[PDB]
Design a protein around this ligand. Structure first.
Ligand SMILES: OC[C@H]1O[C@H](O)[C@@H](O)[C@@H](O)[C@@H]1O
Length: 347
């Protein structure tokens, strides 16, 4: 029931298309880019995942140590104290680790299809205790007061949400961890409502709850409260295991239109649509029963972690939504959707 016009050039960016940004590492994954416009170009703020060349029978990966220095961790695949069933997150002696380190990297484009690094625009790397395992999946809020980045901060003590601000994409201010663990999928709204700031977010409950889309509000972007549960998973549907907002919602006359991701217990991620009241964004007006984009293309089906569509950045020009997205947690893609057709599906 897929209604997305894929870019014929997909994929736009694969790991081999770029030079590694961490010393002695290679690029495993390009995914989940933020999206904005600046100095006449379309930009992606890529999630770039890197690790050492893998040796037979050894999982090895970078973290930052206490002095901020890359350090390589190694575990034997047959070590009985190792749980490596999932390629993204492992356990060893009761503690969790990632198989890669991620950072944020700017690429630019004149055509919105061929992308390249930009001299003077170096990448954004984890800093501090709370970003020791990297930063990920950055949403970019294009606003009157500039650009606001909301991304996953990962470390041995938390998956949480950080926020940064920039005017020129060279200088940044860090607002710290705005949402504690375990939380991600933080889609900041690009405008105020009732002179208040709003964001979607996505706390995960070990028990007594799940992985649902929530709402919070803020006077100042640094401090958040009045949390509300917007939309849960749906038992026995494609979005039965988790849901999360992608990019900021689009202002329409029907309401706030959010292209959200959902996944089942096999970790197959699809896109869906959510519509929310203009003045109370916690009120669900409508929700696509079926996905509006499933992982159908071949580059969407096999990779580092397969059967995954994921967008946390987009552009809107009239009726035409241009989403950029990660495919199989490996490569960058572009596709187009129609507001009118989405709203039509919701009635
Ligand atoms: O955030 C930690 C970890 O959580 C999930 O497993 C995925 O989103 C990974 O890509 C990510 O690195």
């Amino acid at each position: 029931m897929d209604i997305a016009k894929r870019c014929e050039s997909n994929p736009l960016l694969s790991p081999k298309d770029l030079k590694a940004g961490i010393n002695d590492m290679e690029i495993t994954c390009l995914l989940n880019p933020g999206v904005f416009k600046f100095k006449g170009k379309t930009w992606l703020l890529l999630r770039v995942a890197e690790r050492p060349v893998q040796q037979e029978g050894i999982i090895s990966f970078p973290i930052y140590d206490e002095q901020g220095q890359i350090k390589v961790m190694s575990f034997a695949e047959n070590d009985p104290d190792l749980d490596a069933s999932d390629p993204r997150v492992i356990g060893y002696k009761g503690k969790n680790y990632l198989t890669t380190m991620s950072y944020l990297r700017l690429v630019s484009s004149e055509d919105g299809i061929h992308f390249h690094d930009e001299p003077g625009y170096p990448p954004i790397f984890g800093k501090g205790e709370l970003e020791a395992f990297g930063i990920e999946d950055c949403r970019v809020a294009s606003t009157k007061d500039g650009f606001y980045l909301t991304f996953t901060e990962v470390s041995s003590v938390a998956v949480g949400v950080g926020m940064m601000h920039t005017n020129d994409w060279k200088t940044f201010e860090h607002y710290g961890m705005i949402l504690p663990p375990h939380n991600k999928d933080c889609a900041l709204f690009e405008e105020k409502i009732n002179d208040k700031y709003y964001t979607f977010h996505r706390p995960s409950s070990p028990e007594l709850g799940g992985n649902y889309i929530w709402l919070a509000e803020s006077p100042d972007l640094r401090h958040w409260g009045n949390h509300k549960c917007v939309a849960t998973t749906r038992d026995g549907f494609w979005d039965c295991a988790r849901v999360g907002a992608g990019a900021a919602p689009i202002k329409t006359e029907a309401g706030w239109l959010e292209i959200y991701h959902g996944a089942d217990f096999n970790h197959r991620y699809c896109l869906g649509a959510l519509l929310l009241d203009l003045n109370d964004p916690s009120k669900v007006l409508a929700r696509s029963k079926e996905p509006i984009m499933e992982p159908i293309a071949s580059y969407e089906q096999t990779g580092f972690f397969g059967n995954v569509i994921f967008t946390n950045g987009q552009l809107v020009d009239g009726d035409t939504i241009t989403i950029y997205y990660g495919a199989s947690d490996e490569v960058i893609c572009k596709a187009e959707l129609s507001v009118k057709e989405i709203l039509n599906i919701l009635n």
